[PDB]
Amino acid sequence: KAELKGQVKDIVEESGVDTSKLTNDQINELNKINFSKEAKSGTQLTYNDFKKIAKTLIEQDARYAIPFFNASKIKNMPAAKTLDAQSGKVEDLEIWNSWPVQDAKTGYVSNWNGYQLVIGMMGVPNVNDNHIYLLYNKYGDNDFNHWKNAGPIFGLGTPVIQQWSGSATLNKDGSIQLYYTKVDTSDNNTNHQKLASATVYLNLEKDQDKISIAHVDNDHIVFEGDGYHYQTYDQWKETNKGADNIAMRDAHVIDDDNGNRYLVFEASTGTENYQGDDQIYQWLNYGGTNKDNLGDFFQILSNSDIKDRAKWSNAAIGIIKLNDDVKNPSVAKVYSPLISAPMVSDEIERPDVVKLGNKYYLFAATRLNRGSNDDAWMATNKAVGDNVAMIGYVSDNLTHGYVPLNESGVVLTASVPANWRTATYSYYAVPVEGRDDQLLITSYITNRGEVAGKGMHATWAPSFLLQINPDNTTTVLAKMTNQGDWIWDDSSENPDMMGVLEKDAPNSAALPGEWGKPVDWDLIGGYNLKPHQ
Ligand SMILES: OC[C@H]1O[C@@](CO)(O[C@H]2O[C@H](CO)[C@@H](O)[C@H](O)[C@H]2O)[C@@H](O)[C@@H]1O
Ligand SMILES: OC[C@H]1O[C@@](CO)(O[C@H]2O[C@H](CO)[C@@H](O)[C@H](O)[C@H]2O)[C@@H](O)[C@@H]1O
Ligand SMILES: [Ca+2]
Ligand SMILES: [Ca+2]
């Protein structure tokens, strides 16, 4: 019986929608929309941003598309033939999320007694086997085969206690301060994640060029969520009706110029801007033109799966200040999210803050299929056979005021199907010494679990340069390295690592047998692919 009331009235008219042709229920829903302009949880990844990101992906623009790799050159990591944490025996592990021991202000890969040090998740494919390992090479060395493994940081283990991604920097005494995610799986196989820290001490034998783990001290939980800014495990236990992501992970250490230390990490928003049926009616979340936003509003309302995901999406990239106890830190201060995606996504991962000149750049990896807009992400699988991207923001301040790069946030987009050898994920930008406008993008290549075939293991990708423009835009550069190079310099470039999207080229991006092979059931993988321009 009733009618449109408040600001929504103006909105419907602007749109050119015939008010009389609105059913009774429509008007009741429309009257639920809330037009508050006050942002509750930092800069947002909006429904519109998401859609644009997906569109940019489908377009395969050379500005943002992950360069093609020469598939025939990709090999499993030799240092991955190593003692496994959950069996104590030498096995063929694969290696994924990885991070260099790096300086906390500058991000530069650290030089430890002439070695570069990287810490990474490794384990046996198709086994629940998530643990972190220390890897090392001479500093500046580019040979993938020269990396060696110093073993699991915490020794032999089980799936009850796992270690997922974080970061690492050096202490003054040359120990490593490690930030990692401790995960406890005892409560009904849930991944109960906590941000943790430990001091790792190394034994070096100069004459054998061999590093070992000597002591691991001060292992403790640093942060579990506050409940207001960030969701806690308890809050998740209550609400989670099965269809909910839990996140307290991927801590990236950064220092300001005054020597304060912060961890930037992946989480979910707490009660400050919580998930729920209400998030659908927050006009703020749409971020398009009013007309656009109204189309979106209806899409969500009529598609029950989208509506469902929308209720549950509240990914956030959080930040906390640590106290001054370097080796045994506690939380000094909890801030509001740098970025959040209420209604839009339940997963933004591996955040990374690099300070370039005077601005703070924040990047994160995402899988668009964790997004709420099925029509958006199903279309990317149809185009490219993958839905991964790296998003990015810039700010004058570490702790607030982030602004999306390239309009929507997109910085990098998936360019080959997820079950190809050359599929990539877990982008991690590393700064380049004496090039303050470029970043080295590292990642891992080949998805876990042998999706690309037996013996095809997740391994370190060739790295490639990304160009940062002061006008808040980015361009992918056609400059590529050997597999597993964390340190760009002039000797680093290896153009033979570059691929082409052609079936029979010797530097094809597809291995023999991949071009046109199925992904996600029927989708002929490679059909909708096009050259980068
Ligand atoms: O139980 C979580 C744990 O299982 C593993 C190995 O069994 O997952 C593998 O199998 C999944 C499908 O059943 C894949 O989606 C997954 O990517 C693959 O690794 C572990 O990898 C995972 O940590
Ligand atoms: O292996 C855990 C590690 O990988 C990331 C992504 O690089 O998360 C992966 O594992 C989670 C559960 O196994 C998934 O929820 C997520 O989608 C998957 O990509 C990191 O965030 C995490 O530290
Ligand atoms: Ca959620
Ligand atoms: Ca190098």
From Swiss-Prot:
Record's GO cellular component terms: extracellular region
Cofactor annotation: Ca(2+)
Biological role stated in the UniProt entry: Fructosyltransferase that catalyzes the polymerization of the fructose moiety of sucrose to produce inulin polymer and inulin oligosaccharides such as 1-kestose and nystose.
EC number of this enzyme: 2.4.1.9
Temperature dependence: Optimum temperature is 55 degrees Celsius. Activity drastically decreases at 60 degrees Celsius.
Molecular function via GO: inulosucrase activity; levansucrase activity; metal ion binding
Catalysed reactions, as listed in the record: [(2->1)-beta-D-fructosyl](n) + sucrose = [(2->1)-beta-D-fructosyl](n+1) + D-glucose
Domain of life of the organism encoding this protein: Bacteria
Binding positions (Ca(2+) 1): 142, 485, 487, 492
Chain sites annotated for binding Ca(2+) 2: 244, 275, 312, 314, 346
Active-site feature positions: 97 (nucleophile), 349 (proton donor/acceptor)
Binding positions (substrate): 96, 165, 249-250, 347-349, 367
Site, as annotated: Transition state stabilizer: 250
Residue window of the full protein shown: 176 to 708 of 797
Family of the protein in this entry: Belongs to the glycosyl hydrolase 68 family.
Keywords linked to the UniProt accession: Calcium, Carbohydrate metabolism, Cell wall, Glycosyltransferase, Metal-binding, Peptidoglycan-anchor, Secreted, Signal, Transferase
GO biological process: carbohydrate utilization
Compartments it resides in: Secreted, Cell wall
Lineage: Bacteria, Bacillati, Bacillota, Bacilli, Lactobacillales
Record's bilayer topology term: Peptidoglycan-anchor
Name of the protein described by the UniProt record: Inulosucrase
Record keyword Signal present: yes
Record note on pH: Optimum pH is 7. More than 85% of the activity is retained in the pH range 4.5-6.0. Activity decreases sharply at pH 7.5.
Top EC class of this enzyme: transferase
